[PDB]
């Protein structure tokens, strides 16, 4: 127990006011009750609630030479136990607890999902936190408020437009169920106002939340100069430096444009799409990422002539049987695919005009991999080909923080090669680019920094869901990566089609929705992958991610009794394997 | 040992053709290839796929004295290994396997979820099976086809009407999302006509499935006379006996009418509601089971004036905090409650009138427990006050199978006190009254009987969902029983409200949907109960039932990453306890 104590000296030194406590100890309440009465921010850690809380008391007695808890540190200076605190009078203690050397305990570059979460949790454990967020506008001029990609130009509006697309099919279902429905035209502007109304309520909400936690939100861009100070330029344009013990990089990504004539001038991305003045008209999406396919999906169902232009395959990195069934379904309900094919140029012939409500005409050319060129006209070109980490122009050259393929490299505590610089969320090279990951990395990092806990974020078995017109949720390995990792002499795949009961009265096509489990027979038939394609794929999937953290096996799904009538119950009765060739 | 060695003797003797095998072995494959070309139905159990497979290969060596596989039995007669079968030749060989002391290996009284599932899996493993199902009509004369309660008058039509109710609300949601809809009136006749067409499609499906499996379906009523013969009266009244080695009671339940004037004469039950000629009009439901509230729920959203009359409490046996929000929500969107109050009488004032519509008018009065009487008029009275098991007039007095409040009592192998009589589904005293339970119990019983498997059905952690206008799913113990079982300072309750992102734009009311986990701190913070109240509650809940068979703790929900944006992710970040008194 040699350097796991020096790892804890380290967490003690870069914390703020920190109190090692126990739940039943009377002494601890008196010092904590007193810090609250003098408005002293602190963070505490309670060792009766740790399986290893025993080893913490061992380690603390080498650091301090004291045997009991409480043990209290002011930014590394050990103040002592209970009576050492009651011998500092009510104002030399308050004065001593706020000297720092730096303006801030922590500066967070980036106010996204993860920055905001790390900020809120850090302040609740005593930290003086500055949170920087500034939204460099799109080429066509789009910006948004506090909240990051998810809130403004990501999950929240995407899913909301997805739900305006679902209700169109829900409403044609409703006639089979006895309702006489008119269903008329779709008013694009009324929907984008409802959506931007929720966003602004979340802009307001995250901004309120930061003030009530005593986080200094500064609407300014961050750049690193040295490990302990950050350069900030704000709206008005003035530079100011601030000093910090800790730097967190949480800058996310922004969409990529292909290097082709007219891309930035005339195209849009997800950043622009959730705020368009006008129905996009005849649309071309470029790329076959989840963002491209989800956008084509709800745009088609809202009423647009949509065309997707795919360089090669759909959803590279996802299971490709499933990627086939998404695209086959998108394809069977109006979304046209040109593939394989890449754009070469986009020029403007006619221009958008709010003096008539008539959309620009753009013509896009392209190469078809075979050489045949492509040429057609669209009113909107939407580039959805990937996103790039915001690692340029933040000073990582000045401190020599390592990057790999644009992403900040980080250990299992989200720390870089400089021991006081961290990176969380999408700019990490850890985990999927998902906001619940960003939020968890935030909350756990906050409690290691400012309560000295050892909780680490777990990046295995992370669930995802793709909100294409028929949704696709998955956990774990694709069938092709499991077969590669473990060998086909070790993989069994159970599968089945299924027909949501909600679809039989409306006469939607059976043998479309699909469930499959990837099984590693050599490890007690462990469920190493989980895939579902059907309605409400997000809510089907979530619970099973808990069972796979517990190591669920095929035995365990079958022992579980289904809920009838649901889509999710088909996973309690999978029967048919793939090696058997029997029909699914 | 000793006791279990005879337990296997027994399933060998009451089996049909039985083959104990291993998957390594051509010697087994050659015996079974020969049975398949000689059109011999058999059931096999493969001993490599049993964790205890070693103990079978030494138990058999006590019955037979051989250690090798294959080993083959014909209804208890031990024929031997691979060369012992490669004599006999193709015709005295086929004569030995069709010799029986009875007309059937198994007769099943009841063609519901459990019976139908039990029959198919038995036939697939070698049994000569007769399946009896006959539907004695309602007071009003209504009947239905093969399939049992769930297919004809239960889960399937219930949920379809529920989905007609949801789509009405999904359609106002859609105006906030930009659609000029709008919704006209609801045609009851077109909806049940679509519903019964799917029902009929399952009637046909289950009868085809029985014929393709070579079960003799007899649309007749079953009565026991001795352990080994069943009396069958068909449509006519012609009785015929059939003899059987094993009897299964799977006769389900049917709804109870209260003992009051006019109950059977003028009211209806769930058995009638899913087939009604007419829109029910202004309706009264009596009772507060899940069946009463779900029906009350969808009738209301479809357009009816509905009223529920509760002798005491909502959803007796469920968590009653949840039962509160189920009703509080029903009540706040059009359904009227009189409670506490009980029926006394129903008489008729006007009668049907074709086809001037003029629906029957009935007058129901009652007493309010306080004594105050009740009196009013409705066009439909629906009794949802319970269901009673079909154990009268099936002959259990003749062989003396024990019952407790009408339910056939049964052990962990679903056997009664008569060793060749079993009972599955709702006539059990085992488990909740749920279709996936009937099916799983049937399906495991089939292989103890005809593969000599030892798989037992698990009645712990069964998830249920109530499809009220806002749905309610749950697993495990209610909050009130966890405190009884474990004591209140060993339970912590995490909870939170949540707002489905689909509800933000339409401005459906915040702090309505609700999630809570019941935690037993004394057993490593194990999750002993799980409750969610919200949209798509069946699909939210199902996966977590798997996680609770694996012993999920609060730690484990917290380690799991949410799928954003979903309702189910709120169980990955529950934070506020009840003992803390903070807001949810
Ligand atoms: C169209 C789209 C749909 C998506 N749908 C989902 C989904 O359904 N479910 C899911 O889980 N995830 C989804 N995601 C991904 C999710 O949005 C991201 O994973 C999440 O927002 C990342 O959080 P973050 O905090 O790491 O980065 P961000 O949220 O992007 O936060 C970065 C913030 O820092 C700002 N910033 C950048 N540089 C600086 C700088 N030098 N100084 C100061 N501020 C700076 C940025 O302007 C931004 O506000 C989607 C993404 C997109 C683009
Ligand atoms: C309105 C309603 C809604 C429900 N919703 C759900 C739900 O959403 N999810 C869920 O899991 N469960 C639900 N259930 C319960 C589910 O339907 C039952 O638990 C399931 O049907 C029981 O299956 P069973 O095979 O044991 O009996 P049954 O399905 O009832 O079938 C028994 C069959 O045997 C016939 N029979 C009776 N006596 C004889 C006799 N002497 N001889 C020959 N045949 C006989 C009967 O006519 C019947 O057809 C619901 C029930 C009702 C009433």
Describe, in short, the structure shown.
Helix content of chain A is 33%, strand content 24%. Chain A has 584 residues and is an alpha/beta fold. In chain A, strand 13 (306-309), helix 13 and strand 14 form a beta-alpha-beta unit.
List the ions, cofactors and other small molecules found in this model.
flavin-adenine dinucleotide
Number of strands of chain A: 28
Cα(first) to Cα(last) distance of chain A is: 55 Å
Q: Over the alpha carbons, how many angstroms does the gyration radius of chain A reach? A: 27 Å
Oligomer: homodimer
CATH architecture of the largest domain in chain A: 3-Layer(bba) Sandwich
Q: Which two protein chains have the largest interface (Cβ within 8 Å of the partner's Cβ), and how many residues from each?
A: A-B, 81 and 80 residues
CATH class of the largest domain in chain A: Alpha Beta
Q: What structural category characterises the helix and strand content of chain A?
A: alpha/beta
Give the helix level of chain A as a range of percent.
Answer: 25-40%
Kindly report the CATH topology of the largest domain in chain A.
Answer: FAD/NAD(P)-binding domain
CATH superfamily (homologous) name of the largest domain in chain A:
FAD/NAD(P)-binding domain
How many domains make up the coordinates of chain A? Answer: 4
Shape of chain A: globular
Helix count, DSSP H or I runs of 4 or more residues of chain A: 18
Strand content of chain A: 15-25%
Q: What kind of sheet is the major sheet of chain A?
A: 7 strands, mixed
Protein name (chains A, B): thioredoxin-disulfide reductase (NADPH)
Domain Glutaredoxin (chains A, B): 17-79
GO molecular function (chains A, B): flavin adenine dinucleotide binding; glutathione-disulfide reductase (NADPH) activity; thioredoxin-disulfide reductase (NADPH) activity
Family (chains A, B): Belongs to the class-I pyridine nucleotide-disulfide oxidoreductase family.
């Amino acid at each position: 127990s040699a350097e796991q104590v020096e790892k804890l000296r380290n967490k003690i030194n870069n914390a703020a006011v920190l109190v090692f406590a126990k739940s039943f100890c009377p002494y601890c309440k008196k010092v904590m009750e007193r810090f609250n009465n003098l408005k002293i921010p602190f963070g505490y850690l309670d060792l009766d609630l740790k399986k290893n809380g025993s080893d913490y008391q061992k380690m603390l007695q080498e650091i301090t030479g004291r045997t009991t808890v409480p043990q209290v540190f002011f930014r590394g200076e050990f103040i002592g136990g209970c009576d050492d605190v009651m011998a500092i009078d009510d104002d030399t203690i308050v004065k001593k607890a706020n000297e720092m050397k730096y303006d801030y305990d922590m500066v967070i570059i980036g106010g996204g999902s993860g920055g905001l979460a790390l900020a809120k949790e850090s302040a609740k454990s005593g930290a003086k936190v500055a949170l920087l967020d500034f939204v460099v506008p799109t080429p066509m001029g789009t910006t948004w408020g506090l909240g990051g990609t998810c809130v403004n130009v990501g999950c929240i509006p995407k899913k909301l437009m997805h739900q305006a697309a679902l209700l169109n099919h829900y409403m044609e279902d409703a006639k089979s169920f006895g309702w006489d429905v008119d269903k008329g035209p779709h008013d694009w502007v009324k929907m984008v106002e409802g959506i931007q109304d929720h966003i602004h309520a979340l802009n307001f909400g995250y901004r309120s939340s930061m003030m009530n936690a005593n986080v200094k939100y500064l609407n300014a861009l961050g750049e690193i100069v040295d490990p302990h100070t950050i350069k900030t330029t704000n709206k008005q344009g003035i530079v100011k430096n601030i000093t910090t013990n800790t730097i967190i990089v949480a800058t996310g990504e922004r969409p990529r444009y292909p290097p082709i004539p007219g891309a930035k001038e005339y195209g849009i991305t997800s950043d622009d799409l959730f705020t368009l003045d006008h129905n996009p008209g005849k649309t071309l999406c470029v790329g076959a990422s989840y963002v491209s396919l989800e956008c084509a999906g709800f745009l088609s169902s809202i009423g647009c002539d949509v065309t997707v232009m795919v360089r090669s395959i759909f959803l590279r990195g996802f299971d490709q049987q499933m990627a086939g069934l998404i695209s086959d379904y998108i394809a069977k309900y109006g979304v046209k695919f040109v593939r394989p094919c890449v754009p070469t140029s986009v020029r403007c012939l006619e221009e958008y005009d709010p003096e008539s409500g008539k959309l620009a005409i753009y013509e896009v050319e392209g190469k078809h991999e075979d050489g045949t060129p492509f040429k057609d006209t669209f009113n909107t070109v939407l580039f959805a080909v990937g996103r790039d980490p915001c690692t340029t122009n933040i000073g990582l050259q000045n401190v020599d923080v390592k990057t790999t393929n644009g992403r900040v490299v980080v250990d299992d505590e989200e720390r870089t090669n400089v021991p006081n610089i961290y990176a969380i969320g999408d700019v990490s090279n850890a985990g999927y680019q998902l906001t619940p990951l960003a939020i968890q990395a935030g909350k756990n990092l906050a409690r290691r920094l400012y309560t000295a806990d050892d909780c680490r974020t777990d990046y295995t078995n992370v669930p995802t869901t793709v909100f294409t017109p028929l949704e696709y949720g998955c956990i774990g390995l694709s069938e092709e990566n499991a077969i590669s990792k473990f060998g086909e002499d070790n993989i069994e795949v159970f599968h089945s089609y299924f027909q949501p009961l909600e679809w039989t009265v409306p006469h939607r096509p059976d043998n479309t929705c699909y469930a499959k489990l990837i099984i590693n027979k050599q490890d007690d038939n462990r469920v190493v992958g989980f895939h579902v394609f059907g309605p409400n794929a997000g809510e089907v999937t979530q619970g099973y991610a808990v069972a796979m953290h517990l190591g669920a096996r095929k035995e365990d799904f079958d022992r579980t009794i289904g809920i009838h009538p649901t889509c999710s119950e088909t996973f309690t009765t999978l029967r048919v394997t793939k090696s058997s060739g029997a029909s699914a």
